[PDB]
Amino acid sequence: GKLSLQDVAELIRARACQRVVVMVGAGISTPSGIPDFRSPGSGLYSNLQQYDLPYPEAIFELPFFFHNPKPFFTLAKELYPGNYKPNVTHYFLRLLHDKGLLLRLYTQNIDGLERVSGIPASKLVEAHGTFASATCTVCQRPFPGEDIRADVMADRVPRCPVCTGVVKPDIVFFGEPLPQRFLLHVVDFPMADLLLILGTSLEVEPFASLTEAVRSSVPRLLINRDLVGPLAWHPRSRDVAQLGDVVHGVESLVELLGWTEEMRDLVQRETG
């Protein structure tokens, strides 16, 4: 006795849902070639034995970064924007934006692929910050994101040209304050008429709890390998779970929306 994925498509087609709030995590970028955290076998938290860490979470903790920033920058050579491309998941969200349906996209990812896919900054809440800008950890001087990359790609720990203190990209490490734009969740979540949650385990707060901030009649559509978080534990009557690979699930929705040729055209134009 549940809504189907077709029911969600048909709400969108009818513009009965036209203020969509989306929440994403690391699962949406595995198809682009970036590991997630928690997937058995391939996740970061399963495969950081080599790094100089007390435990894997440490690489993304501000305290440990001060001790040794090397593991973080070693790893960020890779993760640094330029070398991965958005996938169909990202371009679907672009298409939602272009059709006037996207209220806001909240991302936990630092890969920057939402911006890469053409989502305007005003539509985006990068809840864990960005590599696009950087900041001295001693003097607070801001820097050209790009300038820091020069150093990172050439295997050097970025130091301030002024105080020589370590320059850190504007990423929210563990325990750190969320970015200023995160405050938009108070205007957004009550206004949302559909919530889409893609590729996240919903293990970390505040995202786990935002899924409960939408009004009780709002459908929640999960596209993800597993049923997770508040959707597993506190199901609501208009929840839909499309479980399986995220690209498959998005492609199923896109087909039900009638957008398949538009998405093919989009993707070919952008990346093909």
Ligand X SMILES: CC(=O)O[C@@H]1[C@H](O)[C@@H](COP(=O)(O)OP(=O)(O)OC[C@H]2O[C@@H](n3cnc4c(N)ncnc43)[C@H](O)[C@@H]2O)O[C@@H]1O
Ligand Y SMILES: NC(=O)[C@H]1CCCc2c1[nH]c1ccc(Cl)cc21
Catalytic residue IDs: 128
3-state secondary structure 187-202: HHHHHCCEEEEECCCC
Looking at beta carbons, which residue is closest to ligand Y? 109
Q: Looking only at residues 115 through 154 of this chain, which bind Zn ion when binding is defined by CB under 5 A?
A: 136, 138-139, 141
Residues in the chain: 272
Q: Looking only at residues 149 through 178 of this chain, which bind ligand Y when binding is defined by CB under 6 A?
A: 171, 173
Helices (H), 224-259: 229-233, 246-257
Residue with token string 């809840």: 127
C-alpha span between 91 and 154 (Å, rounded): 31
Select from 125, 224, 231, 242 the one that contacts ligand X (CB under 6 A). 224
Q: Which is nearer to ligand X, 119 or 250 (CB)?
A: 250
Q: Which is nearer to ligand X, 135 or 211 (CB)?
A: 211
The pattern of x and - marking residues 155 through 194 that bind Zn ion according to CB under 5 A reads -----x-xx-x-----------------------------
Name which of 37, 64, 39 is nearest 52 in CA terms: 64
What single DSSP character describes residue 110? S
Amino acid at the residue 69: P
| Residue 51 lies near ligand Y (rule: CB under 6 A) | no
User: What values do phi and psi take at 26, rounded to 5?
Assistant: -70, -25
| Residue 200 lies near ligand X (rule: CB under 6 A) | yes
Sign (positive/negative) of CA torsion 94, 118, 89, 3?
negative
- Report, in Å, the least distance between residue 271 CB and ligand X: 18
Residue with token string 């790094």: 51
Q: Which is nearer to ligand Y, 78 or 98 (CB)?
A: 78
| Residue 225 lies near ligand X (rule: CB under 6 A) | yes
Contact range with ligand X by CB under 6 A, out of 21-29, 91-99, 115-123, 212-220: 21-29
Q: Looking only at residues 26 through 85 of this chain, which bind ligand X when binding is defined by CB under 6 A?
A: 26-27, 30-31, 36-39, 43, 60
Measured between alpha carbons, how far apart are the two ends of the chain, in Å? Answer: 41
- Residue 195's Cβ-side half-sphere holds a number of Cα atoms within 13 Å equal to 30
Q: Looking only at residues 74 through 133 of this chain, which bind ligand Y when binding is defined by CB under 6 A?
A: 79, 108-111, 128
Write out the two tokens for 220.
């929640």
| Residue 160 interacts with, from Zn ion, ligand X, ligand Y, none (CB under 5-8 Å by kind) | Zn ion
Burial of 211 (0-12, 13-18, 19+ CB in 10 A): buried
Residues that bind Zn ion (CB under 5 A): 136, 138-139, 141, 160, 162-163, 165
Residues that bind ligand X (CB under 6 A): 25-27, 30-31, 36-39, 43, 60, 108, 128, 174, 199-201, 203-204, 224-226, 228, 245-246
